[PDB]
Write a protein that binds this DNA or RNA. Sequence first.
RNA 1: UGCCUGGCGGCCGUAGCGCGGUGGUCCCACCUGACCCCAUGCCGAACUCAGAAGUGAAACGCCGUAGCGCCGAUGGUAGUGUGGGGUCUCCCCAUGCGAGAGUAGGGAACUGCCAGGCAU
RNA 2: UCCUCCUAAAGAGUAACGGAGGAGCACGAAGGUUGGCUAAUCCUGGUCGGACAUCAGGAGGUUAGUGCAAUGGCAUAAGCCAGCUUGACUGCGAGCGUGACGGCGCGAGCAGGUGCGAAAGCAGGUCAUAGUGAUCCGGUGGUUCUGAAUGGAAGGGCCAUC
RNA 3: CCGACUUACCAACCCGAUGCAAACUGCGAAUACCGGAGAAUGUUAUCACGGGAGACACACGGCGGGUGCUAACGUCCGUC
Lengths: 177, 67, 136, 116, 50
Amino acid sequence: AKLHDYYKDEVVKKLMTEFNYNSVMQVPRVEKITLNMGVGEAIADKKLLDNAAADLAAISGQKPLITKARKSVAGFKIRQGYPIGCKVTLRGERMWEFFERLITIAVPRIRDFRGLSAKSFDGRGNYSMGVREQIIFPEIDYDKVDRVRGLDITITTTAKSDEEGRALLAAFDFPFR
Amino acid sequence: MKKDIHPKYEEITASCSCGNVMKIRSTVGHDLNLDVCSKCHPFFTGKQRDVATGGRVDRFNKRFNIP
Amino acid sequence: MLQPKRTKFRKMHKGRNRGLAQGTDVSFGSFGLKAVGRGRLTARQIEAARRAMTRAVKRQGKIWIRVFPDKPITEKPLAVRMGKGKGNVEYWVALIQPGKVLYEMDGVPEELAREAFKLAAAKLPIKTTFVTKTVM
Amino acid sequence: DKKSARIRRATRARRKLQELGATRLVVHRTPRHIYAQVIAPNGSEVLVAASTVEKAIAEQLKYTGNKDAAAAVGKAVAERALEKGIKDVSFDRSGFQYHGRVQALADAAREAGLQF
Amino acid sequence: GIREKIKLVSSAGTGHFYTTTKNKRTKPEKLELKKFDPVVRQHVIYKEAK
RNA sequence: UGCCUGGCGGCCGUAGCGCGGUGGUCCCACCUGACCCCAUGCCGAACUCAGAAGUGAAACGCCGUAGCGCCGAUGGUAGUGUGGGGUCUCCCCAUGCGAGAGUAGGGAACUGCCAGGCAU
RNA sequence: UCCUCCUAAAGAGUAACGGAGGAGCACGAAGGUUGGCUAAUCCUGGUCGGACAUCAGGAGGUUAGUGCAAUGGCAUAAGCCAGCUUGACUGCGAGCGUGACGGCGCGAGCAGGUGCGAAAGCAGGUCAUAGUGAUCCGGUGGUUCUGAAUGGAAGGGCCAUC
RNA sequence: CCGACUUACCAACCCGAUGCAAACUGCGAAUACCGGAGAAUGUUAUCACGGGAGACACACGGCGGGUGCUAACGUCCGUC
Ligand SMILES: [Mg+2]
Ligand SMILES: [Mg+2]
Ligand SMILES: [Mg+2]
Ligand SMILES: [Mg+2]
Ligand SMILES: [Mg+2]
Ligand SMILES: [Mg+2]
Ligand SMILES: [Mg+2]
Ligand SMILES: [Mg+2]
Ligand SMILES: [Mg+2]
Ligand SMILES: [Mg+2]
Ligand SMILES: [Mg+2]
Ligand SMILES: [Zn+2]
């Protein structure tokens, strides 16, 4: 919670002063971070998915969820019930630890960096993004992983709109344009 | 957290080439020395880019020694 | 040739043509052709009337078809005996009750619309009449 | 949401008890308080009740919302039912699991004398 | 009609048995079930037979 | 006795949606923490436990308001049982029953038991 | 031969070489019970990834789902998931439905012995309706029955089965 | 590096106005049927058991339909 404490001492009041919120809990707070990574090639090789699951358990210290097909789609040759994806949800101290790790170490390590887009808020303030490459996390040992495998990071926030969503992210010195 | 099934998850340390060391808890397994951090980056108010940070750039120009 | 693009079933019972009509008012245009009698309008009958009626007004105004052939009619081939299943669908018809407005017209003078409906009603088996729009 | 899910959980036991025509001991649980009512088979009239929102029970309870609070209210509700003449009831957890205070209340009622 | 009639004989040795069906191409292992024995009036293990 | 709140019903849209406002004494909810009781195909989100710092934001309750949902006559029409007629693929007459849709309107529920808080 | 809908005229039933579709199974879990859970579709944002894979939010509210046709039903789910388990129990059976009959179906409750649940309780197969074949003749196991002078035995009977 | 517009093209979903249905129903009769009570009328007209049958080729007419051509002194059902 080394950034949870950082949140509650300045950021709450910072949004309070500049948005005229009536109560302090009206200042939004990030509730969970969902770590999604859909392999899409388990049909070709089941065995690449367990290795992929191990990769995501290294980057974030949690066992990932193996998602099911949930519906048969012939355009991709999938039948329902087949393992197709990997998922983790992080809340509380583990969530904050992953958040600070991402922003401080990993986000600078992005190749061909230009920062992050500020328009991917789905209209309701919840951020979602995709990293192009996976070696950027120091948890995984370079040269011991089979292939590069990106993933999607979505920040689900209590914020009801993107404007106050941007205030929360910016008060964390999130990389906006 | 389920304990038998879950990986070991303890405290580590990570130092930057600039001499800035960050205290954090992760699962790399052992301490590491990283090269670029959030503070030493041109996008995070990076007036002092990593050019002033040496490396294989120094070996070349100290090899060549031609201004 | 008016005809449903697809149907839930390809054959239907004969049924009965009883009762009065729904849609007895000029709802779209200003003038209308209203059925006085009852009977069946084949798609060929409806389409032949439409050709005469649209050609009468020199392709002016707007023409509305208010009826649709949705009832399929089967006919046994020549010189086949009774039974051996139901016949094959030959054509489609709409059932017509007294008072139903069959065609509507707009954008043309009343004296021209009256003449156009005369030529059109010459193609229909059922007695018709000329009606105009009214405020209810 | 939360309350709607709990009602859907409780409904099957509630309707089954109504069909059996059994006196039903309904337990309610909130983070600060726990409630218990003995309900007549017709379902509209209550017979005895005991809760931690009560002047008599609160002074003894150090902190309402505890298992000891559940034991106190269970003994209290059980003695009131016993002295009125009600001896056989059917438990209605009201969509809660029979693990903590619901189990604690039921366990408290057992020693004092209810049959369920 | 792939499923075939099989006999489940009590392990109590009384000769009573039940009949049922089993698919033998899959699940080729024996079927075992604690079932009631009307002769000894008890529940005993019944084993696959026939 | 009046108001507020919680629980269990009656009842099953006149009762449900939407829009706006309003409540934290108690209550309710959010909420604090979690080796633990207990739990997550992972995750204290839910479930559970230990608590009461903050807050009524959401939710929930209450108040107001017809943009809907809903209820809805009278009259007429359709149909139809019995008997009798015609120009008999369909109608009509005597008599009995009499819709559906629509219209004028109504309408922001009413109510029972217990428990608590405030007031008298 | 059997099941579903319409014809079939608002109880049941109702014909045609009338209009349309299915069955001759499957499952020791896909059954019992306890606990838990709730879709289709669309919009917005998101690595490969696009109309359409996994993810977050929203709308929407069953427009999904049911092992297999159709109708009726299903949220207290009868739909989805997990733990434990064999009640897919044995002898009966008030009463009732449906058939000319053969027969078919439903069933509380009683007895014995069980499973799940803390308990009230639930369980005599599956959301229901197709998945089927009389009698004779034999085969197999058991049996407190019979046994052509008697004691056996063969054969027969009864029960369970092919 | 993510962009911002535009035109007389196509245009799904949605809205408003229209109809149609044996295998459509958010509505819905008249009758018919089942049951309870009451009077009057009816040679028990009702049920059960037993002795004896015949009959199981129907026809037309009305009303409600399928089939046929709302053709047939056609054909197949319901009801009188
Ligand atoms: Mg009227
Ligand atoms: Mg009306
Ligand atoms: Mg009306
Ligand atoms: Mg009928
Ligand atoms: Mg009838
Ligand atoms: Mg099933
Ligand atoms: Mg002898
Ligand atoms: Mg004969
Ligand atoms: Mg005959
Ligand atoms: Mg006849
Ligand atoms: Mg004849
Ligand atoms: Zn640095």
